[PDB]
Design a protein around this ligand. Structure first.
Ligand SMILES: Cc1cc2c3c(c1C)C(C)(C)C[C@@H](O)N3c1c(nc(O)[nH]c1=O)N2C[C@H](O)[C@H](O)[C@H](O)COP(=O)(O)O
Ligand SMILES: Cc1cc2c3c(c1C)C(C)(C)C[C@@H](O)N3c1c(nc(O)[nH]c1=O)N2C[C@H](O)[C@H](O)[C@H](O)COP(=O)(O)O
Ligand SMILES: [K+]
Ligand SMILES: [K+]
Ligand SMILES: [K+]
Ligand SMILES: [K+]
Ligand SMILES: [Mn+2]
Ligand SMILES: [Mn+2]
Lengths: 497, 497
């Protein structure tokens, strides 16, 4: 199976690319594996594959850190993400987001069923399960538990049987047979939990699959539409079906070549202390647990030489900024286009810590729409901040089509020089607000409401008569004849290539 | 004479550091010199010394571009600035600003008069002067003239004779014997021009000194207090007097080793078209000239082999971002300390395009005040935004003492995660606004008023009981024993140094 369709084939692709370190020395899953991974993420180094985790037994487990973090080569910065998606290692951020959006305009390719696969090579069942005896990592020193679940796919199906959702949500080991993890509004795992709650089900069939096909984990992190089963969307991205096998203990289906599958139930009735957890915004709050739903594990199936993927998330740059913000930005682009707004591109600048999205405006179309920044900024916020895809994003920055929204430097330049603070901003006090941001849950106003802004970083003339400045930069303040002279002289004179 | 007291010594210091290219090929002062310089600024390369400027005659002139721009090596990033100030090339931005602040708490070292110096080696006088025939650079293609003056020192004295101001303000060639340049409120050149106008003086004695002692050009860019002559401040920074020679044609004094001195008058009545100019925020507006005062030049004196310094300012990173906002931040820190606010440090983040200052708060002292961010942000703005030192700055960001204000990554992390948009901001509609910023002059509200904000990026508990989180980073989320095990294994396992 190709790398985008098999986690094991993806790991070997990173090895072939020289983007993987095989660590064969013993590494402790209590902090050491995550500390190595954290420093990889903070330095854009090669992904670490821990082949000798202390406490591993009977094939459970190796650990892959930083599975979708950045490479240090500028020309292949996004290559570990590209290897999730059948793209070359030189793919741009736009190429990745365009590929993830490509399935929203074409028929799903429905999964196919196989009778077995590598995920059935080994099993542990019932009273033989002891989750506290497995090498689940301690990911940050002040976490409230061992976060086994930082890069697996939760599988949960609606009561009518017709919608099966795939998504990432954190979970930690809470006991011999239990996890606790976030099941928050407005996420689909919570929407489906509440559908079951409403018909009186206490324990919902559930599976959690680790080391799924890489296209599948990318869709699991993307807010594709309500009621759309990720499996068919993934098939459409890949141009071929995902091969699924039925769980042994329930009627759910998991990718046949998953590394590790947990089969069990998600409760509607029981919660347990969950967290704290070093999170996507770069914070942990020591001692601060909150109740979250209980998952019960009834069977584990796994591949020979199974690998658990791990996101050691926190300060820049890890999967929470390369995937959560960016895939939300992709869906916000789509939503703005479907609302009729003249948006060509969107990205989640790394500087914004997954809380900002920059929206690139087709200014020719903007001028034809005969509006103004104050009206336009309010309309954009009303469109985006009242939808699920806008939930995690607190600042939208509108920029014209001379700004590369995929380049944080261009976004900051435009923000700092084109948006008059206050005057050119529309603030949103009444929309859902993302409590996990420290200025929300640990701030001065309601943790779950408001705290959002649309920043109009289009200059006034961009709405009316057009761009009337020239950038004071090498590209725009010198004619081509002068630029060519300089570029042809540069290295001969003694300047750096 | 050492590099901080002689521009010629400073040029040799840059050559010795491997931070200067001697360009001996012919370079056109019409755009080509500035295009080279611009590309050096955008890529942090070596300073260009143009030894063969097309049209140079009679020893006028060589050009040094990028005199205070950044070096590419992380360990010596500010080295070219440090060589202005007798600091090592490894000096931090904080070391530079602390050195510039060092003189407002020691007595001035008054200049000493010498009967002659290298600046008297050559002269051109009266009708022999033709400023249009000199190789003044065209710095950007859409500029309104040849900006001879981007990095020289204007010398002007008050009517009482007690205050001689040294400052940088742009000027372009306007005619055979004239320059036109910005003389704007609230700058000291304009305060002094207005003092002369009020007593009826038509032509004010003036000089412009190019290639001044590097300590002198740093103080020329710093907003030291009203009525304080830069010369004694400069002496205090340098630990000894600047040697000054009297002008031939007026009673002003210039540094004796200056490269080039123009002597003449600044008019209180005469105006000429001035600008546009590719400016510190990254913009030029083609065709947008505005009347500015006229300088008349009656004598030019200059060194053998004279060098004209040139700032090809615009997009990051050039002298307008290494010097203007940074030296303003230094003075804003001291203003806040005199006001009794608990500020320890200040810097102008590069991302803010010289419109942002981050203020570091002593959180122990803050907690003793028993205040809140909303009240505190208002007080800080009310102090800073009604003072000259705060004029060019539109956004102040308040951060706690776990944030390195000299590190744009830490400032952006704090701003994005600790300041709830709108809720945690105080907007200032009535204070003087810096019209040069595009969102002011070419924006939606008054060009000269408002558009300012103080952003409270302290979390709520920082005002009350203290910091209650831990960063989710390598430094703070893993014990020292684990960090050391990782750092000791890092290269042996196959990670990058
Ligand atoms: C890539 C990725 C995504 C997420 C998370 C992580 C990673 C690495 C953690 C490291 C585990 C941190 C955690 O906070 N986490 C997380 C989370 N969404 C939550 O509801 N809960 C979570 O705990 N998302 C985001 C969701 O995966 C997306 O919002 C997705 O769109 C949801 O799918 P759906 O509900 O739209 O189907
Ligand atoms: C370092 C530097 C400083 C300045 C400028 C430049 C450089 C390189 C130009 C490239 C020429 C661009 C130009 O816009 N420019 C400039 C200017 N101030 C002005 O009133 N007018 C200007 O045209 N400053 C800033 C002033 O030098 C400082 O604000 C200083 O504090 C003033 O001295 P004072 O009035 O406080 O004595
Ligand atoms: K999903
Ligand atoms: K605007
Ligand atoms: K000055
Ligand atoms: K705050
Ligand atoms: Mn979904
Ligand atoms: Mn002054």
């Amino acid at each position: 199976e190709p790398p985008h369709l098999s986690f094991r084939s993806f790991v070997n692709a990173l090895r072939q690319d020289g983007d993987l370190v095989d660590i064969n020395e013993p590494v402790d899953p209590d902090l050491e594996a995550a500390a190595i991974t954290r420093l990889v993420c903070e330095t854009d180094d090669k992904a670490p594959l821990f082949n000798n985790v202390i406490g591993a037994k009977d094939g459970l487990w190796r650990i892959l850190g930083a599975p979708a973090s950045l490479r240090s080569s500028p020309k292949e910065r996004f290559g570990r993400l590209a290897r999730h998606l059948a793209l070359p290692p030189t793919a741009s951020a736009k190429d990745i987001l365009d590929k993830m959006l490509s399935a929203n305009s074409i028929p799903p390719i429905e999964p196919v069923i196989v009778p077995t696969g590598p995920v059935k090579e080994n099993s542990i069942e019932g009273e033989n399960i002891d989750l506290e005896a497995l090498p689940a990592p301690m990911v940050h020193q002040s976490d409230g538990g061992k976060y086994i679940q930082t890069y697996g796919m939760h599988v949960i199906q609606s009561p009518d049987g017709c919608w099966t959702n795939w998504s990432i949500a954190r979970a930690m080991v809470s006991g011999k047979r239990t996890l606790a993890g976030l099941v928050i509004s407005p996420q689909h795992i919570r929407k489906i939990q509440d559908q079951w709650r409403a018909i009186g089900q206490e324990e919902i069939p559930w599976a959690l699959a680790f080391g799924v096909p890489p296209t599948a984990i990318m869709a699991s992190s993307m807010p594709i539409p309500d009621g759309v089963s990720e499996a068919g969307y993934v098939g459409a991205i890949a141009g071929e079906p995902i091969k699924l096998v039925k769980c042994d203990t329930n009627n759910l289906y998991v990718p046949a070549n998953s590394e590790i599958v947990l089969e069990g139930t998600l409760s509607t009735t029981k919660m347990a202390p969950e967290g704290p957890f070093g999170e996507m915004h770069g914070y942990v709050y020591p001692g601060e647990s909150h109740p979250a739903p209980v998952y019960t594990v009834n069977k584990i199936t796994y591949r020979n030489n199974a690998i658990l993927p791990m996101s050691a998330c926190g300060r820049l740059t890890d999967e929470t900024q390369t995937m959560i913000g960016t895939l939300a930005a992709a869906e916000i682009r789509q939503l703005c286009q479907r609302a009729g707004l003249p948006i060509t591109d969107a990205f989640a600048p790394f500087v914004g810590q997954a809380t900002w999205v920059a929206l690139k405006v087709d200014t020719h179309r903007l001028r034809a729409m005969k509006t103004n920044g104050k009206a336009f900024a309010k309309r954009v916020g009303d469109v985006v901040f009242t939808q699920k895809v806008g939930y995690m994003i607190h600042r939208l920055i509108l920029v014209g089509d001379d700004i590369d929204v995929y380049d944080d430097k261009d976004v900051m330049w435009a923000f700092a020089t084109r948006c008059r603070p206050g005057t050119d901003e529309v603030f949103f006090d009444d929309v859902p607000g993302f409590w996990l941001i420290p200025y929300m849950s640990h701030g001065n106003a309601e943790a779950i409401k408001g705290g959002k802004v649309v920043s109009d970083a289009l200059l006034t003339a961009e709405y009316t008569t057009g761009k009337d400045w020239e950038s004071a930069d090498f590209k725009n303040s010198y004619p081509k004849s002068i630029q060519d002279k300089v570029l042809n002289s540069w290295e001969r004179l003694g300047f750096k290539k």
